[PDB]
Design an enzyme around this catalytic site. Structure first.
Site, PDB file in Angstrom:
ATOM      1  N   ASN A  98       1.316 -73.112   8.187  1.00 36.79           N
ATOM      2  CA  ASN A  98       1.306 -71.989   9.151  1.00 36.79           C
ATOM      3  C   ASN A  98       0.510 -70.812   8.570  1.00 36.79           C
ATOM      4  O   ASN A  98       0.363 -70.679   7.347  1.00 36.79           O
ATOM      5  CB  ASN A  98       2.738 -71.559   9.474  1.00 36.79           C
TER       6      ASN A  98
ATOM      7  N   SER B 295       4.011 -70.250   5.291  1.00 36.74           N
ATOM      8  CA  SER B 295       5.059 -71.288   5.428  1.00 36.74           C
ATOM      9  C   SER B 295       4.409 -72.617   5.848  1.00 36.74           C
ATOM     10  O   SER B 295       3.235 -72.649   6.174  1.00 36.74           O
ATOM     11  CB  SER B 295       6.148 -70.875   6.373  1.00 36.74           C
TER      12      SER B 295
ATOM     13  N   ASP C 219       5.518 -76.349   8.199  1.00 32.37           N
ATOM     14  CA  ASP C 219       6.450 -77.097   9.090  1.00 32.37           C
ATOM     15  C   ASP C 219       6.517 -78.558   8.619  1.00 32.37           C
ATOM     16  O   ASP C 219       5.463 -79.158   8.287  1.00 32.37           O
ATOM     17  CB  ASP C 219       5.943 -77.052  10.528  1.00 32.37           C
TER      18      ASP C 219
ATOM     19  N   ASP D  28      20.740 -71.110  16.945  1.00 28.93           N
ATOM     20  CA  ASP D  28      20.437 -69.823  16.260  1.00 28.93           C
ATOM     21  C   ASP D  28      20.266 -68.657  17.234  1.00 28.93           C
ATOM     22  O   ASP D  28      20.281 -67.495  16.769  1.00 28.93           O
ATOM     23  CB  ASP D  28      19.184 -69.953  15.395  1.00 28.93           C
TER      24      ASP D  28
ATOM     25  N   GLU E 290       5.446 -82.292  18.542  1.00 27.34           N
ATOM     26  CA  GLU E 290       5.497 -81.588  17.223  1.00 27.34           C
ATOM     27  C   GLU E 290       4.888 -82.475  16.143  1.00 27.34           C
ATOM     28  O   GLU E 290       4.128 -81.947  15.321  1.00 27.34           O
ATOM     29  CB  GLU E 290       6.932 -81.225  16.908  1.00 27.34           C
TER      30      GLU E 290
END
Ligand code: NA
EC number: 3.2.1.17
Length: 129
Positions: free
Chosen positions: A46, A50, A52, A101, A35
């Site tokens: 993104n 958005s 990251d 989640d 990542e």
């Protein structure tokens, strides 16, 4: 801060990720490698607008506030800049909410594509844990 592999393994173990929701420590170290390349300052935009953030590439659409992701949530109740700190506390605490989640570690696309189903114990080989 750019972590070493065993340095990050020790920090992630200290903060409670080893076997968290049944994911062994090597899954978390592997995810961070692919990542962020172990860089707490990593950011990536993104296509939905958005971004990251940090060592585990936590997304501003759901998890943190970056001031420029309209209609987005802030479920970790933190500014996204907090996830770029040399102190990984905020990233770990937020990662624990993400992995709880419903889709587990499949929330991390690099984990799904490059770590899942591989020999993830190799990522903690040679570390003093
Ligand atoms: Na947000």
């Amino acid at each position: 801060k750019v972590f070493g592999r065993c340095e990050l393994a020790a920090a992630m173990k200290r903060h409670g990720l080893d076997n968290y929701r049944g994911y062994s420590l090597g899954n978390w170290v592997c995810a961070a490698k692919f990542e962020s390349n172990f860089n707490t300052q990593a950011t990536n935009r993104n296509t939905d607008g958005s971004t990251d953030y940090g060592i585990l590439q936590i997304n501003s659409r759901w998890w943190c506030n970056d001031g420029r992701t309209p209609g987005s949530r802030n479920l970790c109740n933190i500014p996204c800049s907090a996830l770029l700190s040399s102190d990984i506390t905020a990233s770990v605490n937020c990662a624990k909410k993400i992995v709880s989640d419903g889709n587990g570690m499949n929330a991390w696309v690099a984990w799904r594509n490059r770590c899942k189903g591989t020999d993830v114990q190799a990522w903690i080989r040679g570390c003093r844990l």
